[PDB]
Amino acid sequence: DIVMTQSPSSLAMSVGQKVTLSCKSSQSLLNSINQKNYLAWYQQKPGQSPKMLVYFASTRESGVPDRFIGSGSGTDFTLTISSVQAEDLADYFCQQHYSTPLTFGAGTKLELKRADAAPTVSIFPPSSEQLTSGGASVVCFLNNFYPKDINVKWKIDGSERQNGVLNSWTDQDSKDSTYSMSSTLTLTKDEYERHNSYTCEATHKTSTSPIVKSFNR
Amino acid sequence: QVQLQQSGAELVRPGTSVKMSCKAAGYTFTNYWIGWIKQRPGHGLEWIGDIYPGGGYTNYNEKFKVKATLTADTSSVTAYMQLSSLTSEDSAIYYCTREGNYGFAYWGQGTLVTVSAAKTTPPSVYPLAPGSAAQTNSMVTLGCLVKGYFPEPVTVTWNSGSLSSGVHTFPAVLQSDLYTLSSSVTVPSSTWPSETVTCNVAHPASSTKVDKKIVP
Amino acid sequence: GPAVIECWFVEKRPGALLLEPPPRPDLDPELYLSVHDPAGALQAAFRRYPRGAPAPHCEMSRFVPAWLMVSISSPVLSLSSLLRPLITMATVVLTVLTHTPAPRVRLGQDALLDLSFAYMPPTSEAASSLAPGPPPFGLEWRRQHLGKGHLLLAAAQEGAVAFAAWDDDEPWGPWTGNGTFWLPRVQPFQEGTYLATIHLPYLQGQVTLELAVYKPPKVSLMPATLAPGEAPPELLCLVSHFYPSGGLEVEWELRGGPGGRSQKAEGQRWLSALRHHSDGSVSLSGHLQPPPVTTEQHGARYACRIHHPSLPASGRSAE
Ligand SMILES: *[C@@H]1O[C@H](CO)[C@@H](O)[C@H](O)[C@H]1NC(C)=O
C-alpha cells in the first residue's frame, strides 16, 4: 500500500561534514490525534542486524548521539548527520509504522569520499591443470579504484559476447577505502583453441581511454 | 534485558518446508507483538507478518498469506515461522523483532535460508600466474581461483596467513549450482618468483584443506 | 672500502671505528673501538662502499635498555648499529642497513623502499634464552618531520604495504632478514623524510630515508605572434608538465652560427608565464627577442636549453 522512496541511491561524503537523507511516502503518515509521524529510521552495520535510530520522525533512540536529527512531516522526511565519523558507515532505511502492510525504503548506502583512482587491471590466462580437467577460464582483476562506478567489457579478436561473464564486486575497504572487482570468462577447452586475442577492457572516470590488457594464446 | 536468539542457517532443497525458531528471553513474551522481516540481497527489507502470543494471534501480509505461517509457544518462550513451497527466490535472511508502538527497536540475530538441490562437493582450486610473456613492473599480482564448490563458507589464506596485506578476496558467485570465487595478492617482483607463494584454501563443510603454490 | 671510520660521540668528541693494533694518537681510549661483527652486516656494507666516496657522517650515543648506538649516514647507505664492549673491544649486536637511502621515483609510479637487518644476541642473552628460535619482530614505517608524526605501515590510508621476514629460522647464531615497503601511486604530497623502525622484544633500531619525487618536463619551441602586419620580435619556447619548481633556468643558444655551435642568443627575453595543471604539475612559456637575421646566420637554428633537477646534466634542447 504505502510506498517508501529513499533518496539518494548512495552518497559518499567525507567525515566531519553534515549529510542528509530523504524519504518520501505515498500517503500521509501524520496522525491527527497525538500529532506524530509514524516513521522510523534504521541503521544496519555491514553484515549485522539493523538498529533503530529515530522513531516518530524525531526523538532519537537512547544510546544514539545527538548528531542524528530527524525532521519532516506529511510525506517528506529527512535524516541529517551533522558530523559523520567512522562509526556511521552503514545503510539506513525509512519504514512507515502507520498502515498494513508495513513497508521499508530501498535504502541509502553510506560510503567514504575519496579522490579518483584508476583501477589496476591485470589479466590471467587459464592454468595448465584446468585444461587437463575441465575447460578454460580467463581471469581479469580490477583492484583499488574510486569510485565504485565501473564497467567491464570483453572482446575475442573482434567478437564479443556476455555469455559466461561472471563478475564480482567488493565492498569499500576498511583501510584505504577503495573498491575492487574481478571478472571471469568461463569457457571450455574446445572453443578456446580456435581464437587468438583475449582482452579485458574497462570504463572509469579517471581515464577517458579504457585500460586494455590482452594476451595471445 | 530483552534478547532474541534465532535458529541456525537452513540449507535445504526446493519445494520443501522450513521452520525456524526465535526465543525471547528478558521480558513478558505474551505481552508484545513478534514480527518477521525478510532481507534478500537486491530487494532491501520486507515485512512478512506479526503474531501476538495471546488472544489475537496472527496478521499476515498480502504476499505472505500462503507462505510463512506463524505460530508461537507461550509455555517455552519461542516464536516459530513455518515456510512452505520454498522456491529459489526464498533465499534471504529472516529476522524476528519485538514490535512496538513506534517500530521494532529490538531485533534478532538472524536466520539465513538457502535452497538448492546440489550435493556437497569439494572445491577445485587453480593458481593464477601472469604468464611468462608479461611486463612485470615492480609488483606482480597472483591469484588463487576456487571454482566448483557448494555450501558457502571457505577460508583462503596466503602463506598460512603470514601475508595478509594487499589481499583481496571476492565474494562467492553461484554457477551451475556450484559457487565460485577468487583471491588476489600483490607481491613485489624482488620476492616472486624468488620466494614461494602458496594459497591455502580450507572448506569446513567437506572438511578439506588444499595448499597450492603459484608457479610461472 | 675504508678500514677505519671517523665518528663523533655526542651526549662532541672524536672517535674511531676499526673494522694489527693501530697506534692510538689524538684519540681518547674510550672512543678508539676495535669492532667485531658476528652478523657481518656493517663490515660488509663498509667493504661494499664505493671507491673514492666521501667520508660518511657518523654519530655515537649512549643507549639505555654499556650500550653504544652508532648512526652512520651517507648518500649511499644508511646504517644503525648497537655495540657492546689501548683500544676498547666492541661487539655488534643489532644492525639495520639500507642501501637505498635516497630513492627518486617518478610521479605516479610505485615506490619500493628496501631494508635489511641482522641480529646477533650477546652471550648473556643466548645463555638465558629458552626461546624456540628467532624472536618475533615488528617493523614500523612512518613519515618524519623533525621528530615523529604519522605511522604509515606495520605488521594506513592510500595503501602503503609493509613486508618483513627472515626466511632463515635456524635456532643458532645471528639472523638475517629482509624488509620492504611499497607505496602505490606516489603523489607530490607524499614526498619527504621516512623512518623505518625495527622493534624487537630486546630493543628498537631506526633508520632514516629521504623519498624525493621528480617529473621530467615537456619542451617545445615555436614562433610567436600577436593577433599586426609588421613584425615585433617575439619568439616562444613552451615547457609542459614539470614538478620540481626549483632549479629551472631557461637559456637560449644559436647552433650553427658563424662562431661555433655554442653561442647564446642576444636581445630581449622574459619569463613569467606559468600555469598549474590539474595534477600538481606546472607549465612554462619562454620567450626570446632575437635581432634581425643576417645573411651570415643562414642555415643556423635557434634553440632553448632547459635545466631542471628532474633532467640530466645536459638538460633538454628544442630547435
Ligand atoms: C633479501 O633480498 C635479497 C635481494 O635483495 C635476496 O637475495 C635474499 O634472498 C632476500 N632474503 C630473504 C630472507 O628473502
Please give the backbone phi and psi of residue A87, each rounded to the nearest 5 degrees, phi first.
-80, 10
Order of strands across the sheet that contains A213-216: A151-155, A197-203, A213-216
**DSSP letters spanning B3-26:** EEEE---EEE-TT--EEE-EEEES
Header resolution in angstroms: 3.9
Q: What's phi and psi for C248, nearest 5 deg?
A: -95, 120
**In this structure, what are the phi and psi dihedrals at residue B184, rounded to the nearest 5 degrees?**
-120, 150
Give the residues across from B2 on adjacent strands. Answer: none
Sequential DSSP letters for B56-85: S-EEE-GGGSSS-EEEEETTTTEEEEEE-S
Tell me if chain B has a CB within 8 Å of the CB of C110. yes
Nearest beta carbon to residue B47 from set A103, A120, A133: A103
Structural domains in chain A?
Answer: 4-112 (2.60.40.10), 120-216 (2.60.40.10)
Query: Which helix (H) or strand (E) covers residue C116, if one does?
Result: strand C111-119
Residue type present at position B194: S
Which of B174, B172, B200, B202 is closest to B185 using CA atoms? B200
Longest dimension (CA), chain C: 94
Q: Indicate the residue type of B124.
A: S
A–C CB contacts, 8 A cutoff, strictly below: 10
Residue B60, C-alpha cell as written in the block: 499476515
Amino acid identity of B119? K
Q: Ligand 1 center to residue C165 CA distance, Å? A: 9
Cα A25 from Cα C197, distance rounded (Å): 58
List the domains of chain B with CATH numbers.
3-115 (2.60.40.10), 124-214 (2.60.40.10)
Using DSSP's 3-state secondary structure scheme, residue B160 falls into: helix
Pairing of strands B111-115, B10-12: parallel
**Residues 6 or more apart in contact with residue C158 via CB below 8 angstroms:** A176, C184, C185, C190
Indicate which residue's Cα is closest to atom 11 of ligand 1: C178
SS (H, E, C) C174-201: CEEEEEEEEECCCCHHHCEEEEEEEECC
Helix H, strand E, coil C: the string for chain A is: CCCEEEECCEEEECCCCCEEEEEEECCCCECCCCCCECEEEEEECCCCCEEEEEECCEEECCCCCCCEEEEEECCEEEEEECCCCHHHCCEEEEEECCCCCCCCECCEEEEECCCCECCEEEEECCCHHHHHCCCEEEEEEEEEEECCCCEEEEEECCECCCCCEEEEECCCCCCCCCEEEEEEEEECCCCCCCCCEEEEEEECCCCCCCCCEEEEC
Q: Provide the experimental method for this PDB entry.
A: X-ray
Let me know: does B185 contact B166? Beta carbons within 8 Å.
yes
Instruction: Find the discontinuities in chain B where C to next N exceeds 2.5 angstroms and give the residue preceding each.
Output: none
Strands A10-13 and A108-112: parallel
Q: Which three cell numbers stand for residue A29?
A: 503518515
Q: Are A3 and A99 in contact (CB under 8 A)?
A: no
Q: Cβ of C161 and B165 within 8 Å?
A: yes
CA of C93 to the centre of ligand 1 (A): 21
Q: Which chains touch A (3 or more CB pairs under 8 A)?
A: B, C
Cβ C192 vs Cβ C178: under 8 Å: no
Distance of CA C204 to the CA centre of its chain: 23
Ligand 1: distance of its center to the CA of C76 in Å?
19
**Cell matching residue A179:** 573498491
Nearest CA to A197 out of A154, A141, A139 is that of: A154
Contact at 8 Å (CB) between A16 and A83?
yes
Cα–ligand 1 centroid distance for C176 (angstroms): 9
Q: Are C216 and C199 in contact (CB under 8 A)?
A: no
| Ramachandran bin of B161, using left for φ above 0, alpha for ψ from -120 to 50, beta for the remaining angles | left
Q: Is C268 in the pocket of ligand 1 (CB under 6 A)?
A: no
Our CA-based measurement puts residue C311 at a distance from the nearest CA of chain B, in whole angstroms, of: 23
Place of cell 649512549: C62
Closest Cα to residue C180, out of C99, C119, C258?
C99
- CA–CA dist B96, B104 (Å, integer): 10
Q: Helices H, strands E: what count in chain C?
A: 2, 22
Range of the domain at C240: 218-318
Residue C163, ligand 1, Cβ within 6 A: no
What does the block give as the cell for A34? 497525538
Handedness of CA B4, B5, B11, B15 (dihedral sign): negative
Beta carbon of C178 within 6 Å of any ligand 1 atom: yes
Q: What is the C-alpha to C-alpha distance for residues C94 and C65, in angstroms, rounded to an integer? A: 13
Set of cell numbers at residue C79:
646504517
Q: C112 in contact with B at a CB cutoff of 8 Å? A: yes
Q: Counting beta carbons within 10 angstroms of the beta carbon of residue C247, is it exposed (0 to 12), middle (13 to 18) or buried (19 or more)?
A: exposed
Q: Are B167 and B197 in contact (CB under 8 A)?
A: no
Q: Which three cell numbers stand for residue C300?
A: 643556423
Ligand 1 atom 4: residue of nearest CA:
B190
Q: How far apart are alpha carbons C175 and C196 in whole angstroms?
A: 19
Residue A155 near residue A189, CB atoms below 8 Å: no
* Dihedral of the alpha carbons of B89, B93, B99, B101, in degrees to the nearest 10: -70
Q: Determine the Cα–Cα distance for residues B91 and B114; give it in Å rounded to an integer.
A: 5
Asked if omega into C75 is within 30° of 0 (cis), the reply is: no
Contact C112 B138 (CB under 8 A): yes
Rg of chain C (C-alpha set): 28
